[PDB]
Design a protein around this motif. Structure first.
Motif, mmCIF file in Angstrom:
data_model
loop_
_atom_site.group_PDB
_atom_site.id
_atom_site.type_symbol
_atom_site.label_atom_id
_atom_site.label_comp_id
_atom_site.label_asym_id
_atom_site.label_seq_id
_atom_site.Cartn_x
_atom_site.Cartn_y
_atom_site.Cartn_z
ATOM 1 N N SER A 47 2.854 -2.832 9.059
ATOM 2 C CA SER A 47 3.360 -1.298 8.671
ATOM 3 C C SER A 47 1.899 -0.311 7.932
ATOM 4 O O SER A 47 2.059 0.381 8.306
ATOM 5 C CB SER A 47 4.224 -1.401 7.689
ATOM 6 O OG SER A 47 4.060 -1.799 6.207
ATOM 7 N N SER A 48 1.351 -1.054 6.864
ATOM 8 C CA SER A 48 -0.142 -0.566 6.408
ATOM 9 C C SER A 48 -0.674 -0.246 7.813
ATOM 10 O O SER A 48 -0.971 1.326 7.324
ATOM 11 C CB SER A 48 -0.200 -1.053 5.005
ATOM 12 O OG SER A 48 0.561 -1.022 4.600
ATOM 13 N N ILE A 97 -2.822 3.546 9.259
ATOM 14 C CA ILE A 97 -4.078 3.768 9.254
ATOM 15 C C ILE A 97 -4.320 4.271 10.844
ATOM 16 O O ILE A 97 -5.543 4.836 11.016
ATOM 17 C CB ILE A 97 -4.402 2.423 8.564
ATOM 18 C CG1 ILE A 97 -4.623 2.166 7.220
ATOM 19 C CG2 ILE A 97 -5.853 1.869 8.956
ATOM 20 C CD1 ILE A 97 -5.471 2.685 6.379
ATOM 21 N N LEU A 98 -3.933 3.713 11.210
ATOM 22 C CA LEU A 98 -4.232 4.377 12.608
ATOM 23 C C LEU A 98 -4.063 5.195 13.590
ATOM 24 O O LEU A 98 -4.731 5.824 13.873
ATOM 25 C CB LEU A 98 -4.131 2.654 13.895
ATOM 26 C CG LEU A 98 -4.763 0.990 14.157
ATOM 27 C CD1 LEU A 98 -4.213 0.146 14.904
ATOM 28 C CD2 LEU A 98 -6.368 1.744 13.418
ATOM 29 N N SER A 114 0.835 -0.720 0.154
ATOM 30 C CA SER A 114 -0.003 0.069 -0.190
ATOM 31 C C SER A 114 1.090 1.205 -0.582
ATOM 32 O O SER A 114 1.500 1.135 0.804
ATOM 33 C CB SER A 114 -0.815 -0.154 1.539
ATOM 34 O OG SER A 114 -0.651 0.414 2.189
ATOM 35 N N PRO A 115 0.660 2.221 -0.412
ATOM 36 C CA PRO A 115 1.278 3.700 0.083
ATOM 37 C C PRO A 115 1.605 3.668 1.071
ATOM 38 O O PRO A 115 2.413 4.818 1.526
ATOM 39 C CB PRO A 115 -0.126 5.016 -0.653
ATOM 40 C CG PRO A 115 -0.507 4.029 -1.692
ATOM 41 C CD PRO A 115 -1.386 2.836 -0.552
ATOM 42 N N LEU A 116 1.225 3.254 1.829
ATOM 43 C CA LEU A 116 1.483 3.192 3.824
ATOM 44 C C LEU A 116 2.431 2.178 4.305
ATOM 45 O O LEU A 116 2.857 2.441 5.103
ATOM 46 C CB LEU A 116 0.349 3.051 4.459
ATOM 47 C CG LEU A 116 -0.683 4.294 4.732
ATOM 48 C CD1 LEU A 116 -2.546 4.255 5.505
ATOM 49 C CD2 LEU A 116 0.079 5.608 4.759
#
Ligand SMILES: CC(=O)Nc1cccc(NC(N)=O)c1
Lengths: 412, 412
Positions: A22-23, A27-28, A14-16
């Motif tokens: 790690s993604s 998010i959180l 993902s972009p995160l």
């Protein structure tokens, strides 16, 4: 008769982040994965940013010799698939390989590759087209290459239903197991449409945010200042497994997949109906499929693309399906942070929905400063919300009026 | 338990004709649809011929304005779908529209549109990309446009499994009906990859026949002088219908879809294994699914692409599955006449399998002048063979080692 289906492994680019944990941390913490695009010159384009996968190393997974032949969407698909299978603990053997299949889809597939070979064709001639053009670009080759690498001889296919692809892939894979066609399926989607034709094509349709001077604030689902979706890249894969099979090998079970809905809008090639009628039919199908009272729904991972029409249609559909319970559940768009991974959107969002169940937290909708007319639900603005979540729903809608809903619940 | 699925409607564009009866007439006459490709400069290409759809008038189906928005592959899918629904006599009502869905697929999708938009992008920049580039090019727009035109609110999706697409689409649509998720499905596939990218891409892998001097003899499945497949365009669509629903409205029933098989080779990206082990598992899966003994099969519409490795793999696979019955069944490749429609191959070949049941005739393998080593089965060389056909198989084997088998039986 119909068997139950659980999630035993997950994987992600993902972009995160370059994996799930790690993604999920991004998010959180409400972090944006949106930045100006670095991998090409977009000065002639009205949109110059998106959610790139940062620092992806394909040689963590495959030889550079094989990687060179494959479009990024396939590389991304295989990465997330390898992560999911390893996360599952599953061992492929002669005893079970015929009972493990794969359904990894894409909206657009190998657009970068087709563009690059198109350039070779027009600038040089057809003699410069790669011998790997076809198997390295067409959508079914995530499923193909994964089967070849892991020896998966079960049902082997791919869906392409635009921005609904990840949700449909996962749901239909679950049906495969439900009905006895397989005991295990690797399912999700992958997308890399950040090339000239991709940003140019969505730009031509005026569908993309043009907030080039503040890319992290561009994706603002249900915000009154939203101006289109943010194009993002990556992959989600899940290992789906028949319940007794998972129990029999002592698998760690993240959650149970209890409901799947599909419905067509039959409204418009690209526009959702304002009232959310197709999304409403699809969620109601999925909740009946799950044998649920709609009041059991605690968390909705919205489609939430940051388009004017899409965002409001989703509010209408939720109010219509959930009545006064629409005010008790929590609904968020993780697209506020990841942007719109198109065919991979339903795959990463299915994973975020499962992780909302594991950690008992609703992900935020970041950038929701001024909710628009009628957007008056709990949209988890700004900050993650810890809360009870027994039942999580993940929605996708796409071009062609194609709708998908997945229903997950905690497994004890 | 499981509902029965019958065929009530068929539609087609092929190199043999603009509908089913004209196509089928060519098939039984042993006529080739293969010719040099016109209005397209193939000077620099090693292959200059294939199966084009001749004289297609899209305005029989769409306004010039709607047709300008859609790739030829979509136009072709819509034509086949509209013919099939019209052939079925089905009336869509508010009472049944949520029980009628679509699964029309493509292997390669919108190459011709991608090509022309690439021309504009490189020459003049991204501001000359069409607004309809994305929705007018993605594979699920045949399902999307069909659902919008006819108000179909059932399951709406699209498969993409390369040269297996049409077989998978029909098989999974049949599952939707059998397990009560729909009462009617329009299923099959369409393909128009006779562009520079298609001819160039397959040409670069040296997968195509280069017999430019005799295009009608190029496609010669199991012949010792074959030199690769012939690239062809068109579409097949079937109306699949639950038996009690068909009987209730007095539908004409062509045949029953009794078996569907899927498998993965898990072998190679473009080549089958020599012994056709994947194709053998698939066919066994299909017959098990039908509750039929291999001895009950009368006719096989082969994949029969005219590739050296592909044709021999299928002979091995049939000998393995059918033992002492392998010579009693008739097996033919209609690709001897049609060439290879890639994602639509399985759709038009399903229709040809149904019509072999209706007319009690095995279509020929034309150009089988000198059967190769081990090719001693009844391959119906040169001329159509009237015979008893109760049970008919249609095979597709695609890139990524993805296999599909459909079992049709006579209905009375
Ligand atoms: C015509 C002839 O004798 N020879 C030859 C050899 C190589 C390439 C080509 N041209 C091509 N378009 O493949 C032609």
């Amino acid at each position: 008769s119909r068997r139950r289906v659980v999630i035993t492994g997950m994987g992600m680019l993902s972009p995160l982040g370059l994996d799930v944990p790690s993604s999920w941390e991004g998010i959180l913490a409400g972090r944006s994965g949106i930045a100006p695009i670095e991998h090409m010159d977009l000065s002639a384009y009205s949109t110059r940013f998106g959610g790139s996968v940062k620092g992806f190393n394909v040689e963590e997974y495959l030889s550079a010799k094989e990687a060179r032949k494959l479009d990024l969407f396939i590389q991304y698909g295989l990465a997330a698939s390898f992560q999911a299978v390893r996360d599952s603990g599953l061992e492929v053997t002669d005893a079970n390989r015929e009972r493990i299949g794969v359904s990894m889809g894409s909206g657009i597939g190998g657009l970068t590759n087709i563009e690059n070979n198109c350039r070779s064709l027009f600038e040089q001639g057809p003699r410069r087209i790669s011998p790997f053009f076809v198997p390295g670009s067409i959508i079914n080759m995530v499923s193909g290459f994964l089967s070849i690498h892991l020896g998966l001889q079960g049902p082997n296919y791919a869906l392409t239903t635009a921005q609904t692809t990840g949700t449909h892939s996962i749901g239909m894979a679950a049906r495969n197991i439900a009905y006895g066609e397989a005991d295990v399926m690797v399912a999700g989607g992958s997308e890399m449409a950040a090339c000239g034709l991709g940003l140019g094509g969505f730009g031509a349709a005026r569908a993309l945010s043009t907030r080039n001077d503040e890319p992290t604030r561009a994706s603002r689902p249900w915000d009154r200042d939203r101006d289109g979706f943010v194009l993002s890249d990556g992959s989600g894969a899940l290992v789906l497994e028949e319940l007794e099979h998972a129990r029999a090998r002592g698998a760690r079970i993240y959650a149970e997949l209890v409901g799947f809905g599909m419905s067509g809008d039959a409204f418009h090639m690209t526009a959702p109906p304002e009232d959310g009628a197709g999304a409403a039919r699809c969620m109601k199908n999925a909740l009946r499929d799950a044998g649920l009272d709609p009041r059991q729904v605690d968390y909705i991972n919205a489609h939430g693309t940051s388009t004017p029409a899409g965002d409001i249609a989703e509010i209408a559909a939720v109010k219509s399906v959930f009545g006064e319970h629409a005010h008790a559940l929590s609904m968020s768009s993780t697209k506020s942070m990841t942007g719109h991974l198109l065919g991979a959107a339903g795959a990463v969002e299915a994973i975020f929905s499962v992780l909302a169940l594991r950690d008992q937290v609703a992900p935020p909708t970041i950038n929701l400063d001024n909710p628009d007319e009628g957007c008056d639900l709990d949209l988890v603005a700004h900050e993650a919300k810890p809360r009870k979540i027994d039942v999580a729903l993940s929605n996708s809608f796409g071009f062609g009026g194609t709708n998908g809903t997945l229903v997950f619940r905690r497994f004890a």
